[PDB]
Scaffold this active site. Structure first.
Site, mmCIF file in Angstrom:
data_model
loop_
_atom_site.group_PDB
_atom_site.id
_atom_site.type_symbol
_atom_site.label_atom_id
_atom_site.label_comp_id
_atom_site.label_asym_id
_atom_site.label_seq_id
_atom_site.Cartn_x
_atom_site.Cartn_y
_atom_site.Cartn_z
ATOM 1 N N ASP A 174 6.498 45.124 22.485
ATOM 2 C CA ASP A 174 5.696 44.881 23.950
ATOM 3 C C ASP A 174 6.173 46.062 24.829
ATOM 4 O O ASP A 174 7.120 46.056 25.425
ATOM 5 C CB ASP A 174 6.124 43.603 24.561
ATOM 6 N N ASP A 187 0.093 49.412 27.077
ATOM 7 C CA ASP A 187 0.724 47.958 26.873
ATOM 8 C C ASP A 187 0.426 47.657 25.423
ATOM 9 O O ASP A 187 -0.793 46.724 25.489
ATOM 10 C CB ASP A 187 0.304 47.129 27.931
HETATM 11 C C1 779 Z 1 0.638 41.383 29.614
HETATM 12 N N1 779 Z 1 1.887 41.074 29.310
HETATM 13 C C2 779 Z 1 2.979 41.724 28.528
HETATM 14 N N2 779 Z 1 2.584 42.822 28.108
HETATM 15 N N3 779 Z 1 3.853 40.918 28.447
HETATM 16 C C3 779 Z 1 3.828 39.950 28.785
HETATM 17 C C4 779 Z 1 4.869 39.768 30.285
HETATM 18 C C5 779 Z 1 4.747 40.765 31.192
HETATM 19 C C6 779 Z 1 6.099 41.074 32.227
HETATM 20 C C7 779 Z 1 5.899 42.271 33.040
HETATM 21 C C8 779 Z 1 7.243 42.517 33.903
HETATM 22 C C9 779 Z 1 7.285 41.408 34.805
HETATM 23 C C10 779 Z 1 7.328 40.074 33.902
HETATM 24 C C11 779 Z 1 6.376 39.640 33.022
HETATM 25 C C12 779 Z 1 4.236 38.674 28.175
HETATM 26 C C13 779 Z 1 3.201 38.371 26.889
HETATM 27 C C14 779 Z 1 3.753 39.122 25.701
HETATM 28 C C15 779 Z 1 2.907 39.058 24.584
HETATM 29 C C16 779 Z 1 2.625 37.631 24.201
HETATM 30 C C17 779 Z 1 1.875 36.884 25.379
HETATM 31 N N4 779 Z 1 1.779 35.415 24.985
HETATM 32 C C18 779 Z 1 0.413 34.708 25.357
HETATM 33 O O1 779 Z 1 -0.275 35.249 25.980
HETATM 34 N N5 779 Z 1 0.505 33.808 24.674
HETATM 35 C C19 779 Z 1 -0.469 32.665 24.888
HETATM 36 C C20 779 Z 1 -0.540 31.392 24.293
HETATM 37 C C21 779 Z 1 -1.485 30.400 24.203
HETATM 38 C C22 779 Z 1 -2.507 30.536 24.955
HETATM 39 C C23 779 Z 1 -2.420 31.801 25.918
HETATM 40 C C24 779 Z 1 -1.606 32.711 25.505
HETATM 41 C C25 779 Z 1 2.891 36.992 26.597
HETATM 42 C C26 779 Z 1 2.511 39.973 29.688
HETATM 43 O O2 779 Z 1 2.074 38.892 30.338
#
Ligand code: 779
Length: 386
Positions: free
Chosen positions: A36, A232
């Site tokens: 990530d 990202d």
């Molecule tokens: C954009 N983005 C990202 N690049 N990393 C995160 C965190 C960002 C972070 C930024 C700095 C401050 C704190 C937050 C986390 C993401 C990672 C990939 C898998 C995702 N999982 C899902 O989306 N899972 C999911 C499961 C079921 C239904 C819907 C989604 C969750 C995010 O929202």
């Protein structure tokens, strides 16, 4: 040069995420970890969850150290919560080093884990500024660089298959490479072009011009970076600011107007299907994003095909896709479907991001993705939002 030990060390796909194998603890506990570039915490499942078949068991690690501190991380679609600690971490198909790193042991989550993704945690590769709970929690890559002689750079080749992979195929297939500490020349063709990292928090960049099939979108360039533009690997789509999304979709609809698609397709909700092998790639336009160059008044462009922004999904024997460009209220996000076209170099040492055409991008006999330059571009600093 050549980093054979790390080539082909990723698995996964754009919708579920790309992951690398890692080990945590003593004796080592193997876990698959999503790469990530849009976050900065190393966070792993540490308690049973319906979508996990394994998790980090702190009580089984002799090198586990409890920091006695909780962490709460909400994000748009959900949240993860856990307990901070440190442990010894290695990447089996990585540099041959072991480092002492912070680990957030996830105890509770909502819409974080993905059913069938095969990953159990995430590796936040961005900078300390956006680490949670705060910037004193040293990110993994910072620990790696400080503790070893690994160069302060990594590069990602995310490989989209160009067609749907079923459960067995996605487990058996090579999803790409994460080269830690270097650039592997076998993963790209042509030249690498670099854009400055504007600020070290997210991997923030500046887009200076946008074209749809060579036609200038003609917006004030500040709109393209409102309120930021980031690279990202943890986002699936190319996400664009509301006004840019509206103008881009209008232009993509106009270019592809020989076929009419329902509103739900353009909203990224509904799939579109064609008889096997008949996807009309040629009716869809190429999209060019011009990025600020390293030289004053110079830019370069990256061009993606519909083979990147139409994401393959299973329906039948039809070839089906979802539109992988969507609206954002938090700036531009160059997600996995964009990264799949390119070999991307996160040159932290020189505060720049490199792009080259990926050796694994999906294309057709008539068009290919491109990275080209230079172009004369004035007042590029004005494209950044404050
Ligand atoms: C954009 N983005 C990202 N690049 N990393 C995160 C965190 C960002 C972070 C930024 C700095 C401050 C704190 C937050 C986390 C993401 C990672 C990939 C898998 C995702 N999982 C899902 O989306 N899972 C999911 C499961 C079921 C239904 C819907 C989604 C969750 C995010 O929202």
């Amino acid at each position: 040069g050549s980093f054979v030990e790390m080539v082909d060390n990723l698995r996964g796909k754009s919708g579920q995420g790309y992951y690398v194998e890692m080990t945590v603890g003593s004796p080592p506990q193997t876990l698959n970890i999503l790469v990530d570039t849009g976050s900065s915490n190393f966070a792993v499942g540490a308690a049973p969850h319906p979508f996990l078949h394994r998790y980090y068991q702190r009580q089984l690690s002799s090198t586990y150290r409890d920091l006695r501190k909780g962490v709460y991380v909400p994000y748009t679609q959900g949240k993860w919560e856990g307990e901070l600690g440190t442990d010894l971490v290695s990447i089996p198909h990585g540099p041959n080093v072991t480092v002492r790193a912070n680990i957030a042991a996830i105890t509770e989550s909502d819409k974080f884990f993905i059913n069938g993704s095969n990953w159990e945690g995430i590796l936040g590769l961005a900078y300390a500024e956006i680490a949670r709970p705060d910037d004193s929690l040293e990110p993994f890559f910072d620990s790696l660089v400080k503790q070893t002689h690994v160069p302060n750079l990594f590069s990602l080749q995310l490989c989209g298959a160009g067609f749907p992979l079923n459960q067995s195929e996605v487990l058996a297939s090579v999803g790409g490479s994460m080269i830690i500490g270097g650039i592997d020349h076998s993963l790209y063709t042509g030249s690498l072009w670099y854009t400055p990292i504007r600020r070290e928090w997210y991997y923030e960049v500046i887009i200076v011009r946008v074209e749809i099939n060579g036609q200038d979108l003609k917006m004030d360039c500040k709109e393209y970076n409102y309120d930021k533009s980031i690279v990202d690997s943890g986002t699936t789509n190319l996400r664009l600011p509301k006004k840019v999304f509206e103008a881009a979709v209008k232009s993509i609809k106009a270019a592809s107007s020989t076929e009419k698609f329902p509103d739900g397709f353009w909203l990224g909700e509904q799939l579109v299907c064609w008889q096997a092998g008949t996807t009309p790639w040629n009716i869809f336009p190429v999209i060019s994003l011009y990025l600020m160059g390293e030289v004053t008044n110079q830019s370069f462009r990256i061009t993606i095909l519909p083979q990147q922004y139409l994401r393959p999904v299973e329906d039948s024997q039809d070839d089906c896709y979802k539109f992988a460009i969507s609206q954002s209220s938090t700036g531009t996000v160059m997600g996995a479907v964009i990264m799949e076209g390119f070999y991307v170099v996160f040159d932290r040492a020189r505060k720049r991001i490199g792009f080259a055409v990926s050796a694994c991008h999906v294309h057709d006999e008539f068009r290919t993705a491109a990275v080209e330059g230079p172009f004369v571009t004035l007042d590029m600093e004005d494209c950044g939002y404050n």
